[PDB]
Amino acid sequence: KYHQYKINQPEYKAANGKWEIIEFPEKYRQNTIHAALLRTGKVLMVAGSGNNQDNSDDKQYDTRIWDPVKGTIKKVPTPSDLFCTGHTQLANGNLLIAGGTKRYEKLKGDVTKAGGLMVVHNENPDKPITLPAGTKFTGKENGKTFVSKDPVLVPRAEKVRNDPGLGRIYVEAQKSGSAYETGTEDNYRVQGLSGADARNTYGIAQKLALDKKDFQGIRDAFEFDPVAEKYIKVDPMHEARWYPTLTTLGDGKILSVSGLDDIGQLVPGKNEVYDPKTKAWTYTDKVRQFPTYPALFLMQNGKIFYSGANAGYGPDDVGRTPGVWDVETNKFTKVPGMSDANMLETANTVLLPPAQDEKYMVIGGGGVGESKLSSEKTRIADLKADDPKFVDGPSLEKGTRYPQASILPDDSVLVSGGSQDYRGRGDSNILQARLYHPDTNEFERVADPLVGRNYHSGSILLPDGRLMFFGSDSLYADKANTKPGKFEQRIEIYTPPYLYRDSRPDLSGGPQTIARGGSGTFTSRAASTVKKVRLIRPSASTHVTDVDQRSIALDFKADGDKLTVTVPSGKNLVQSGWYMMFVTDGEGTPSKAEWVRVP
Ligand SMILES: [Cu+2]
């Protein structure tokens, strides 16, 4: 339009950057749900079956590697249905990817009525129990009632605790509409049982709502080798997990937390650790339950910070409170102050730059399950404070689920997209982007994104300083919510303001390996202009969750055209692995990254 003229003016791009749509040849398209920047500089894009029933039925599983410099894309053979998986970079630079989705069950019953899977428990070792069709289950907390359509046989408990018999049955609300939906797990009383039967028999269900498909986890785990460009099978997890968080501990092992299991129950706090040297998994000694994709970050004291951000599931009163988790002792200490604590599902979490400060920001979020509630708020916790607590930061304009959030090499945080309602319901994509500035605690609006991104989206900082945005899985295609949504297969590249100004500093000397506490030397003719150096861990982003990205400040010295940088000593700050190293000048303009390996 004229718009298009406005947003291409030198002054405009200099203050707001600019967006571009990339669309791939039809043959390379997929529903990208997970992405990660690899140490090769290319982006792993993982769809699995892509939340597509035909692909699940055909075992059609997709992965791409996309080269942002050349703009080329290739397919990668994908061994398991690796969407709704967990993932993080290993010390060797491989991406550990574990969990994912079992072949999906057909959705049954009336599309206008809340329902889903009820898992019936039988505590009686003496006898099985059959609940006939039309059995009513009522939530002990939520008070809502659902009815089975078919009989279910629930086998005897087995003695060992008795281990309860379990039987799965579809249940459905009596009347249509969202008034009769639930958003969290509850324990359901079975109406019309008396005595012993009532004592030994009960239901557990996750959300029983209108986006109805029932998903189960798988145990498979792989290392993605970015040099070979292949998935390498490693030992499977002990637990099947759909939506686990994988997060690096102090000793370099990977902790896997939560997820739904092979029958769709929340894994009840049975966490496990991958040792990259043995390529084997071990249960943790002690149990702690969280909802799915919990946002879990390694702190400099070796404990885990849980921000409260999560993708849902489980009860509303277990693992819903932000805090500090000592994995070895299992002590959990609440961090108070969170505003809109009822709107933490589908929020983003960022460890603010520089990571040395241990400040976490929680952005946006929505009510449990398919709630119409959404939060405009940011909330910041400083974990180095005497009494740590969340305090509100700058607000967004609109309540926003699913905001994308990426650390930039200038210490800004790009916060972009999202939607006002569940899965972009009511055509509620928010086509806005901001820079968050940590030092001022201010938001600055920048250019609007071109493509809406809600559920199943993400963003990835690239070595050249641009950012890639992917995904978006709207429930509906139309504002009226009458037709099924189509998965967004375009990506965008966002060029920030800092690339529309003066010449950027030059940098060469990579790739290099630099130990914690060690130093390395790089070349920059513009060394004298460098104000900061940042070692930035590449992102692995899914479901509004990225426990990989962090930006570590490096001390440096300039000596003519030579920059000597020093890596901090702590293994809890500087996780082993590969990092982008950016140098930024006093005008805030970053170099392109060189890659550095920390052993
Ligand atoms: Cu998902």
Coordinates of C-alpha atoms and ligand atoms in Angstrom, one line a residue:
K1 CA 0.0 0.0 0.0
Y2 CA 1.6 3.3 1.3
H3 CA 2.1 1.4 4.5
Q4 CA 4.5 -0.7 2.4
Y5 CA 6.4 2.6 1.5
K6 CA 6.3 3.8 5.1
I7 CA 7.8 0.6 6.5
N8 CA 10.6 0.6 4.0
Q9 CA 11.9 4.1 4.7
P10 CA 15.6 4.2 6.0
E11 CA 14.4 6.1 9.1
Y12 CA 11.7 3.6 9.8
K13 CA 13.9 0.5 9.4
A14 CA 16.6 2.3 11.4
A15 CA 14.1 2.6 14.4
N16 CA 11.9 -0.5 13.8
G17 CA 13.8 -3.1 11.7
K18 CA 11.9 -5.0 9.1
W19 CA 10.3 -8.4 8.5
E20 CA 10.3 -10.8 5.5
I21 CA 8.2 -13.8 4.7
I22 CA 10.0 -16.9 3.5
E23 CA 7.9 -19.5 1.8
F24 CA 9.5 -22.8 0.8
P25 CA 8.9 -24.9 -2.3
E26 CA 5.8 -27.1 -1.7
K27 CA 7.9 -30.2 -1.4
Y28 CA 9.9 -29.0 1.6
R29 CA 6.9 -27.7 3.6
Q30 CA 6.0 -29.1 6.9
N31 CA 4.3 -28.1 10.2
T32 CA 7.4 -27.0 12.2
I33 CA 6.6 -27.3 15.9
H34 CA 10.2 -27.3 17.3
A35 CA 13.3 -25.6 16.2
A36 CA 16.9 -25.3 17.3
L37 CA 19.9 -23.4 15.9
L38 CA 22.8 -25.9 15.4
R39 CA 26.5 -25.1 15.9
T40 CA 26.8 -25.5 12.1
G41 CA 24.8 -22.2 11.7
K42 CA 21.9 -24.1 10.3
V43 CA 18.4 -24.5 11.9
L44 CA 16.9 -27.9 12.7
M45 CA 13.2 -27.7 12.1
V46 CA 11.2 -30.5 13.5
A47 CA 7.5 -31.4 12.6
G48 CA 7.2 -35.1 13.3
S49 CA 3.7 -35.8 12.1
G50 CA 3.0 -32.1 12.5
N51 CA -0.3 -32.4 14.5
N52 CA -1.9 -33.9 11.5
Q53 CA -4.0 -37.1 11.7
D54 CA -3.2 -38.4 8.2
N55 CA 0.6 -38.1 8.8
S56 CA 0.2 -39.9 12.1
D57 CA -1.8 -42.7 10.4
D58 CA 0.9 -42.9 7.6
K59 CA 3.9 -42.6 9.9
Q60 CA 4.9 -39.6 7.9
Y61 CA 7.4 -37.8 10.1
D62 CA 9.3 -34.7 9.0
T63 CA 12.5 -32.7 9.8
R64 CA 14.3 -30.0 7.9
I65 CA 17.6 -28.4 8.1
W66 CA 17.4 -24.8 6.8
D67 CA 20.5 -22.7 5.9
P68 CA 19.7 -19.1 6.7
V69 CA 22.8 -17.8 4.8
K70 CA 22.3 -19.6 1.5
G71 CA 18.6 -20.0 2.0
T72 CA 18.6 -23.7 1.1
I73 CA 16.6 -26.4 2.8
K74 CA 16.8 -30.2 3.0
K75 CA 14.8 -33.1 4.5
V76 CA 16.1 -35.3 7.2
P77 CA 14.9 -38.8 7.8
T78 CA 12.9 -38.8 11.1
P79 CA 12.7 -42.0 13.1
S80 CA 9.9 -41.4 15.5
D81 CA 7.1 -38.9 15.9
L82 CA 9.2 -36.2 17.4
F83 CA 6.7 -33.4 18.0
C84 CA 5.6 -32.7 21.5
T85 CA 9.1 -33.8 22.4
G86 CA 11.8 -32.4 24.7
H87 CA 15.2 -31.2 23.6
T88 CA 18.3 -29.4 24.7
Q89 CA 21.9 -29.1 23.5
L90 CA 24.5 -31.6 24.9
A91 CA 28.1 -30.7 25.8
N92 CA 29.2 -32.3 22.5
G93 CA 26.9 -30.0 20.5
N94 CA 24.4 -32.7 19.6
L95 CA 20.7 -32.0 20.4
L96 CA 19.3 -34.5 22.8
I97 CA 15.6 -35.1 21.7
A98 CA 13.4 -37.4 23.7
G99 CA 9.7 -38.2 24.1
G100 CA 7.1 -37.3 21.6
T101 CA 3.7 -38.5 20.4
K102 CA 2.1 -42.0 20.1
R103 CA 0.0 -42.7 17.1
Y104 CA -3.1 -40.6 17.8
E105 CA -6.5 -42.0 18.8
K106 CA -9.5 -41.0 16.7
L107 CA -11.7 -38.3 18.4
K108 CA -15.2 -39.7 19.2
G109 CA -18.6 -38.4 20.2
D110 CA -20.3 -35.0 19.9
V111 CA -18.0 -32.2 18.8
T112 CA -20.1 -29.6 20.7
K113 CA -19.8 -31.3 24.0
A114 CA -16.8 -31.2 26.5
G115 CA -15.1 -34.5 27.0
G116 CA -12.1 -36.8 26.7
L117 CA -10.4 -39.7 28.4
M118 CA -11.2 -40.8 31.9
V119 CA -8.8 -43.1 33.6
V120 CA -10.6 -45.3 36.0
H121 CA -8.7 -46.7 39.0
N122 CA -9.7 -49.9 40.8
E123 CA -8.0 -50.4 44.2
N124 CA -9.7 -53.8 44.8
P125 CA -7.3 -56.7 44.4
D126 CA -10.1 -59.3 44.7
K127 CA -12.2 -58.4 41.7
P128 CA -12.4 -56.4 38.6
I129 CA -15.2 -53.9 38.2
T130 CA -17.2 -53.1 35.1
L131 CA -18.8 -49.6 34.9
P132 CA -21.7 -49.7 32.5
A133 CA -22.3 -47.1 29.7
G134 CA -24.0 -44.0 31.2
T135 CA -21.9 -44.0 34.3
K136 CA -21.6 -40.5 35.7
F137 CA -18.2 -39.2 37.0
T138 CA -18.2 -35.9 39.0
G139 CA -15.1 -33.9 39.7
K140 CA -14.3 -33.6 43.4
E141 CA -12.9 -30.1 42.9
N142 CA -14.6 -28.9 39.8
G143 CA -18.1 -30.3 40.5
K144 CA -18.6 -31.0 36.8
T145 CA -20.2 -34.2 35.4
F146 CA -19.3 -36.4 32.5
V147 CA -20.9 -39.6 31.2
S148 CA -19.4 -42.7 29.6
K149 CA -20.9 -43.8 26.3
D150 CA -19.5 -47.4 26.6
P151 CA -18.9 -49.9 29.3
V152 CA -15.4 -50.2 30.7
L153 CA -13.8 -53.2 32.3
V154 CA -11.4 -52.2 35.1
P155 CA -9.1 -55.0 36.1
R156 CA -8.3 -56.0 39.6
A157 CA -5.6 -54.2 41.5
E158 CA -2.3 -56.3 41.8
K159 CA -1.0 -56.6 45.3
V160 CA 2.8 -56.0 45.5
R161 CA 0.4 -50.6 48.1
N162 CA -2.1 -52.4 45.9
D163 CA -1.2 -51.3 42.3
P164 CA -4.6 -50.1 41.0
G165 CA -6.3 -51.6 38.0
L166 CA -6.6 -49.0 35.3
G167 CA -9.2 -48.7 32.5
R168 CA -9.6 -45.9 30.0
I169 CA -13.0 -44.7 28.9
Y170 CA -14.2 -41.7 26.8
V171 CA -16.6 -39.4 28.8
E172 CA -18.7 -36.5 27.6
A173 CA -20.7 -33.7 29.1
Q174 CA -24.5 -34.0 29.0
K175 CA -25.0 -30.5 27.5
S176 CA -23.2 -28.6 24.8
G177 CA -21.0 -25.6 25.4
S178 CA -17.9 -24.3 27.2
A179 CA -19.7 -23.8 30.5
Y180 CA -19.3 -27.6 31.1
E181 CA -15.6 -27.9 30.3
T182 CA -12.7 -28.4 32.7
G183 CA -9.1 -27.0 32.3
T184 CA -7.0 -29.1 34.7
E185 CA -6.8 -32.6 36.1
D186 CA -9.4 -33.7 38.7
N187 CA -10.3 -36.8 40.7
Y188 CA -13.8 -37.9 39.8
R189 CA -16.3 -39.7 42.0
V190 CA -18.3 -42.5 40.3
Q191 CA -22.0 -41.9 41.0
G192 CA -24.1 -44.8 42.1
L193 CA -21.4 -46.9 43.8
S194 CA -21.8 -47.6 47.5
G195 CA -19.6 -49.0 50.3
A196 CA -16.5 -50.9 49.3
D197 CA -16.9 -50.1 45.6
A198 CA -17.1 -46.4 46.1
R199 CA -13.9 -46.6 48.3
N200 CA -12.0 -48.7 45.7
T201 CA -13.1 -46.9 42.5
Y202 CA -12.5 -43.4 41.1
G203 CA -11.6 -41.6 37.9
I204 CA -8.7 -39.3 36.9
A205 CA -9.0 -37.1 33.9
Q206 CA -7.1 -34.3 32.3
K207 CA -8.9 -31.3 30.8
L208 CA -12.3 -32.4 29.4
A209 CA -13.0 -29.6 26.9
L210 CA -13.7 -28.9 23.2
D211 CA -10.2 -29.3 21.7
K212 CA -10.6 -33.0 22.4
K213 CA -7.9 -35.3 21.0
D214 CA -6.2 -37.5 23.5
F215 CA -2.4 -37.8 23.3
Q216 CA 0.1 -40.2 24.7
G217 CA 3.8 -40.2 25.1
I218 CA 6.7 -42.4 23.7
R219 CA 10.0 -43.3 25.3
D220 CA 12.3 -42.9 22.3
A221 CA 15.4 -40.7 22.5
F222 CA 18.0 -39.6 20.0
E223 CA 20.9 -37.3 19.6
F224 CA 20.7 -35.1 16.6
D225 CA 24.3 -34.8 15.1
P226 CA 24.5 -31.5 13.3
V227 CA 27.6 -32.5 11.3
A228 CA 26.2 -35.8 10.1
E229 CA 22.8 -34.2 9.9
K230 CA 21.2 -37.4 11.3
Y231 CA 19.3 -38.6 14.3
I232 CA 21.3 -41.1 16.3
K233 CA 19.4 -43.6 18.4
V234 CA 20.4 -43.7 22.0
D235 CA 18.8 -45.5 25.0
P236 CA 15.2 -44.7 25.5
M237 CA 13.8 -43.1 28.6
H238 CA 12.3 -45.2 31.3
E239 CA 9.1 -43.2 31.1
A240 CA 7.1 -42.4 28.0
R241 CA 6.7 -38.6 27.9
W242 CA 4.6 -36.3 25.8
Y243 CA 5.8 -32.7 26.5
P244 CA 8.8 -33.3 28.8
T245 CA 11.2 -30.5 29.6
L246 CA 14.9 -31.5 29.1
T247 CA 17.2 -29.2 31.0
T248 CA 20.9 -29.3 31.8
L249 CA 22.1 -29.8 35.4
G250 CA 25.4 -28.6 37.0
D251 CA 27.2 -31.9 36.3
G252 CA 26.3 -31.7 32.6
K253 CA 23.7 -34.5 32.8
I254 CA 20.2 -33.8 31.4
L255 CA 17.2 -33.8 33.6
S256 CA 13.9 -34.9 32.0
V257 CA 10.7 -33.8 33.8
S258 CA 7.0 -34.4 33.4
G259 CA 5.0 -35.2 30.3
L260 CA 2.0 -37.5 29.7
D261 CA 2.7 -41.2 29.8
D262 CA 1.9 -44.1 27.4
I263 CA -1.8 -44.1 28.5
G264 CA -2.1 -40.3 28.8
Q265 CA -1.6 -39.9 32.6
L266 CA 0.6 -37.2 33.9
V267 CA 3.9 -38.8 34.8
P268 CA 3.6 -38.5 38.7
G269 CA 7.0 -36.8 39.4
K270 CA 9.2 -39.7 38.2
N271 CA 12.0 -37.7 36.7
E272 CA 15.1 -39.1 35.1
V273 CA 18.7 -38.1 34.1
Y274 CA 20.6 -38.7 30.8
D275 CA 24.3 -39.1 31.1
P276 CA 25.8 -38.1 27.8
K277 CA 29.0 -40.2 28.5
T278 CA 27.1 -43.5 29.0
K279 CA 24.2 -42.5 26.8
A280 CA 21.9 -44.0 29.4
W281 CA 19.0 -42.8 31.6
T282 CA 18.6 -43.1 35.3
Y283 CA 15.7 -42.3 37.6
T284 CA 16.2 -39.5 40.1
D285 CA 16.0 -40.8 43.7
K286 CA 13.2 -38.5 44.7
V287 CA 9.9 -37.5 43.0
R288 CA 8.6 -34.1 42.2
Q289 CA 5.6 -33.5 39.9
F290 CA 5.2 -30.6 37.5
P291 CA 2.9 -29.7 34.7
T292 CA 4.1 -30.3 31.1
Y293 CA 6.9 -28.2 29.5
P294 CA 7.8 -26.6 32.8
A295 CA 10.2 -23.7 32.4
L296 CA 13.2 -25.0 34.3
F297 CA 16.6 -23.2 34.3
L298 CA 19.9 -24.0 35.9
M299 CA 20.9 -21.3 38.4
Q300 CA 24.5 -20.4 39.3
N301 CA 24.2 -22.2 42.6
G302 CA 23.2 -25.4 40.8
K303 CA 19.5 -25.4 41.7
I304 CA 16.8 -25.2 39.2
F305 CA 14.5 -22.2 38.9
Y306 CA 10.9 -23.0 37.9
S307 CA 9.2 -19.9 36.6
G308 CA 5.7 -21.3 36.7
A309 CA 5.4 -21.2 32.9
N310 CA 4.1 -24.5 31.6
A311 CA 2.0 -26.0 28.8
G312 CA -0.6 -27.4 31.2
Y313 CA -2.0 -30.7 32.5
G314 CA -2.1 -32.1 36.0
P315 CA -3.9 -30.5 39.0
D316 CA -4.2 -26.8 39.6
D317 CA -2.6 -27.1 43.0
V318 CA 0.6 -29.1 42.5
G319 CA 3.7 -27.8 40.6
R320 CA 2.0 -24.5 39.8
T321 CA 4.0 -22.2 42.0
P322 CA 7.3 -20.6 40.8
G323 CA 10.3 -21.5 42.8
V324 CA 13.8 -22.8 43.5
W325 CA 14.3 -26.5 43.3
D326 CA 17.3 -28.3 44.6
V327 CA 17.2 -31.5 42.6
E328 CA 19.6 -33.6 44.9
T329 CA 17.6 -32.8 48.1
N330 CA 14.2 -32.2 46.4
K331 CA 13.6 -29.1 48.5
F332 CA 11.4 -26.6 46.7
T333 CA 11.2 -23.1 47.9
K334 CA 8.4 -20.8 46.5
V335 CA 9.3 -17.5 45.0
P336 CA 6.3 -15.2 45.7
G337 CA 4.9 -12.2 43.9
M338 CA 3.7 -13.5 40.6
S339 CA 0.9 -11.4 39.1
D340 CA -1.8 -13.2 37.1
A341 CA -0.6 -16.5 38.7
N342 CA -3.8 -18.0 37.2
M343 CA -2.4 -17.2 33.7
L344 CA 0.9 -19.0 33.5
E345 CA 0.0 -21.6 30.9
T346 CA 1.4 -20.6 27.5
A347 CA 3.6 -17.8 29.0
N348 CA 7.2 -17.4 27.9
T349 CA 10.2 -17.3 30.3
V350 CA 13.6 -15.7 29.5
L351 CA 16.8 -15.7 31.6
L352 CA 17.6 -12.0 31.0
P353 CA 20.9 -10.8 29.5
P354 CA 23.4 -10.9 31.1
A355 CA 22.8 -14.4 32.6
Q356 CA 25.2 -13.4 35.4
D357 CA 22.4 -11.3 37.0
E358 CA 20.0 -14.2 37.5
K359 CA 16.9 -12.2 36.5
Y360 CA 14.0 -14.1 34.9
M361 CA 11.1 -12.6 33.1
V362 CA 7.7 -14.3 32.6
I363 CA 5.7 -12.9 29.7
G364 CA 2.0 -13.2 29.0
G365 CA 0.1 -16.5 29.4
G366 CA -3.5 -17.6 29.7
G367 CA -6.0 -19.3 32.0
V368 CA -5.8 -23.1 32.4
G369 CA -6.9 -25.3 29.6
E370 CA -9.0 -23.5 27.0
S371 CA -9.8 -20.5 29.2
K372 CA -10.6 -17.1 27.6
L373 CA -8.4 -15.4 30.1
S374 CA -5.1 -13.9 29.0
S375 CA -2.4 -11.8 30.6
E376 CA -0.8 -8.6 29.4
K377 CA 1.8 -8.6 32.2
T378 CA 5.5 -9.2 32.4
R379 CA 6.9 -10.4 35.8
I380 CA 10.5 -10.3 36.8
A381 CA 12.3 -12.2 39.5
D382 CA 15.8 -11.3 40.6
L383 CA 17.2 -14.4 42.2
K384 CA 20.3 -12.7 43.6
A385 CA 18.0 -10.5 45.8
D386 CA 18.0 -11.0 49.6
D387 CA 14.2 -11.9 49.5
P388 CA 13.5 -12.9 45.9
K389 CA 10.1 -12.2 44.4
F390 CA 8.4 -11.4 41.2
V391 CA 7.7 -7.7 40.4
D392 CA 5.6 -6.5 37.5
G393 CA 7.5 -5.1 34.5
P394 CA 6.2 -3.2 31.5
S395 CA 2.9 -4.4 30.2
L396 CA 1.8 -5.5 26.8
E397 CA -1.2 -3.7 25.2
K398 CA -3.3 -6.9 25.1
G399 CA -3.5 -10.2 26.9
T400 CA -1.2 -12.5 25.1
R401 CA -0.8 -16.3 25.1
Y402 CA 2.2 -17.7 23.2
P403 CA 4.4 -14.7 23.0
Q404 CA 7.7 -15.4 21.2
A405 CA 10.8 -14.1 23.1
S406 CA 14.4 -14.2 22.0
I407 CA 17.5 -12.7 23.6
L408 CA 19.5 -10.4 21.3
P409 CA 23.2 -9.7 21.2
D410 CA 22.7 -6.2 22.4
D411 CA 21.1 -7.3 25.6
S412 CA 17.6 -6.5 24.4
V413 CA 14.8 -9.1 24.3
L414 CA 12.6 -9.4 21.3
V415 CA 9.0 -10.1 22.4
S416 CA 6.7 -10.8 19.5
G417 CA 3.4 -12.2 18.3
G418 CA 1.1 -14.5 20.4
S419 CA -2.7 -14.3 20.5
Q420 CA -5.4 -12.9 22.8
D421 CA -7.3 -16.2 23.0
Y422 CA -6.7 -20.0 23.0
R423 CA -5.1 -21.2 19.8
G424 CA -5.8 -17.9 18.1
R425 CA -9.6 -18.3 18.7
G426 CA -11.7 -15.4 17.3
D427 CA -8.9 -14.6 14.8
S428 CA -7.0 -13.3 17.9
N429 CA -3.4 -13.3 16.6
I430 CA -1.6 -10.2 17.8
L431 CA 0.6 -8.8 15.1
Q432 CA 2.9 -6.7 17.3
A433 CA 6.6 -6.8 18.3
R434 CA 8.6 -5.0 21.0
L435 CA 12.1 -4.7 22.3
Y436 CA 12.4 -5.2 26.0
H437 CA 15.3 -3.3 27.5
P438 CA 16.5 -5.0 30.8
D439 CA 18.5 -2.0 32.0
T440 CA 15.5 0.4 31.9
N441 CA 12.7 -2.2 32.3
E442 CA 11.0 -0.6 29.3
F443 CA 9.2 -1.8 26.2
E444 CA 9.8 -0.2 22.8
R445 CA 7.4 -1.0 20.0
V446 CA 9.1 -2.1 16.7
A447 CA 7.8 -3.2 13.3
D448 CA 4.7 -5.4 13.2
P449 CA 5.3 -9.0 12.2
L450 CA 3.7 -10.1 8.9
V451 CA 2.4 -13.5 10.0
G452 CA 0.3 -14.4 13.0
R453 CA 1.8 -16.8 15.5
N454 CA -0.1 -18.5 18.3
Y455 CA 0.1 -22.1 19.5
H456 CA 3.0 -24.2 18.1
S457 CA 5.3 -21.3 17.3
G458 CA 8.7 -20.1 18.2
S459 CA 11.7 -17.9 17.4
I460 CA 15.4 -18.5 16.9
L461 CA 18.3 -15.9 17.0
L462 CA 20.7 -16.5 14.0
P463 CA 24.4 -16.1 13.8
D464 CA 24.1 -13.1 11.5
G465 CA 21.9 -11.2 14.1
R466 CA 18.6 -11.6 12.4
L467 CA 15.9 -13.9 13.8
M468 CA 13.7 -16.6 12.4
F469 CA 10.1 -17.1 13.4
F470 CA 8.2 -20.3 12.7
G471 CA 4.9 -22.2 13.2
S472 CA 1.4 -21.3 14.4
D473 CA -1.4 -23.9 14.7
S474 CA -4.8 -22.0 14.9
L475 CA -7.7 -24.1 16.1
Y476 CA -10.0 -22.4 13.5
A477 CA -9.5 -20.7 10.1
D478 CA -12.2 -18.0 10.7
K479 CA -13.1 -15.4 13.3
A480 CA -16.5 -17.1 13.8
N481 CA -14.8 -20.4 14.8
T482 CA -16.8 -22.7 12.5
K483 CA -14.1 -24.1 10.2
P484 CA -10.8 -26.0 11.1
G485 CA -7.5 -24.0 11.2
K486 CA -4.6 -24.7 8.8
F487 CA -1.1 -24.9 10.1
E488 CA 1.1 -21.9 9.3
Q489 CA 3.9 -23.2 7.0
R490 CA 5.6 -19.9 6.2
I491 CA 8.5 -18.6 8.3
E492 CA 9.7 -15.0 8.8
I493 CA 13.1 -13.4 9.2
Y494 CA 13.2 -10.3 11.4
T495 CA 16.0 -7.9 10.9
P496 CA 16.4 -5.7 14.0
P497 CA 17.1 -1.9 14.0
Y498 CA 20.7 -2.6 14.9
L499 CA 21.4 -3.8 11.3
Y500 CA 20.0 -0.6 9.6
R501 CA 22.5 1.8 11.0
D502 CA 26.3 2.2 10.7
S503 CA 28.7 -0.5 9.5
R504 CA 28.8 -3.4 12.0
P505 CA 32.0 -4.4 13.8
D506 CA 34.0 -7.2 12.0
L507 CA 35.0 -10.3 13.9
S508 CA 37.1 -13.4 12.9
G509 CA 39.1 -16.1 14.7
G510 CA 36.3 -18.8 15.1
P511 CA 35.6 -21.5 15.6
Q512 CA 37.6 -21.8 18.8
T513 CA 37.4 -23.9 21.9
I514 CA 37.8 -21.9 25.1
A515 CA 37.7 -23.5 28.6
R516 CA 35.8 -22.0 31.5
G517 CA 38.3 -19.6 33.1
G518 CA 40.3 -19.6 29.8
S519 CA 41.0 -16.9 27.3
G520 CA 41.0 -16.7 23.5
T521 CA 42.0 -14.0 20.9
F522 CA 40.0 -12.8 18.0
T523 CA 40.5 -10.2 15.3
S524 CA 38.4 -7.1 14.8
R525 CA 39.7 -4.0 13.0
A526 CA 37.0 -2.3 15.0
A527 CA 38.2 -3.7 18.4
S528 CA 38.5 -0.2 19.9
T529 CA 34.8 0.4 19.3
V530 CA 33.6 -2.9 21.1
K531 CA 31.6 -2.1 24.3
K532 CA 30.5 -5.7 25.1
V533 CA 31.0 -9.3 24.2
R534 CA 28.3 -11.9 24.7
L535 CA 28.4 -15.6 24.5
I536 CA 24.9 -16.7 23.5
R537 CA 23.7 -20.3 23.8
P538 CA 21.6 -21.2 20.7
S539 CA 17.9 -21.6 21.2
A540 CA 15.9 -24.8 21.2
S541 CA 12.3 -23.5 21.1
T542 CA 8.9 -25.2 21.4
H543 CA 5.6 -24.5 23.1
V544 CA 6.6 -21.1 24.3
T545 CA 9.5 -22.7 26.1
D546 CA 13.3 -22.3 25.6
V547 CA 15.6 -23.4 28.5
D548 CA 18.7 -23.3 26.2
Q549 CA 19.0 -19.6 25.3
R550 CA 21.1 -17.4 27.6
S551 CA 23.6 -14.6 27.1
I552 CA 26.8 -14.6 29.2
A553 CA 28.9 -11.5 29.5
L554 CA 32.6 -11.9 28.7
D555 CA 35.3 -9.8 30.1
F556 CA 37.6 -8.6 27.2
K557 CA 40.6 -6.6 26.4
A558 CA 41.3 -4.8 23.1
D559 CA 44.9 -4.6 21.8
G560 CA 45.0 -3.0 18.4
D561 CA 42.9 -5.2 16.2
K562 CA 43.0 -8.1 18.7
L563 CA 40.2 -8.8 21.2
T564 CA 41.1 -11.2 24.0
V565 CA 38.0 -12.6 25.7
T566 CA 37.7 -14.6 28.9
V567 CA 35.1 -17.2 29.7
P568 CA 33.7 -17.1 33.3
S569 CA 34.6 -20.0 35.6
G570 CA 31.3 -21.4 36.8
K571 CA 29.9 -24.7 35.1
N572 CA 26.4 -23.7 36.3
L573 CA 26.6 -20.4 34.4
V574 CA 28.6 -21.5 31.4
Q575 CA 27.2 -24.9 30.5
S576 CA 29.5 -27.0 28.3
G577 CA 28.6 -26.8 24.6
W578 CA 28.6 -24.5 21.7
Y579 CA 27.8 -20.8 21.8
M580 CA 27.6 -17.8 19.4
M581 CA 30.0 -15.1 20.4
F582 CA 28.9 -11.6 19.4
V583 CA 30.8 -8.3 19.9
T584 CA 28.8 -5.2 20.1
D585 CA 30.0 -1.6 19.7
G586 CA 29.1 1.5 21.7
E587 CA 26.3 2.3 19.2
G588 CA 24.8 -1.0 20.0
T589 CA 25.6 -2.6 16.7
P590 CA 26.6 -6.3 16.8
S591 CA 29.1 -8.3 14.7
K592 CA 28.1 -11.5 13.1
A593 CA 28.7 -14.3 15.6
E594 CA 31.8 -16.6 15.7
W595 CA 31.2 -20.0 17.2
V596 CA 32.9 -21.0 20.5
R597 CA 33.0 -24.4 22.1
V598 CA 33.2 -24.5 25.9
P599 CA 34.4 -28.0 26.9
Ligands
CU1 CU 1.5 -29.3 21.1

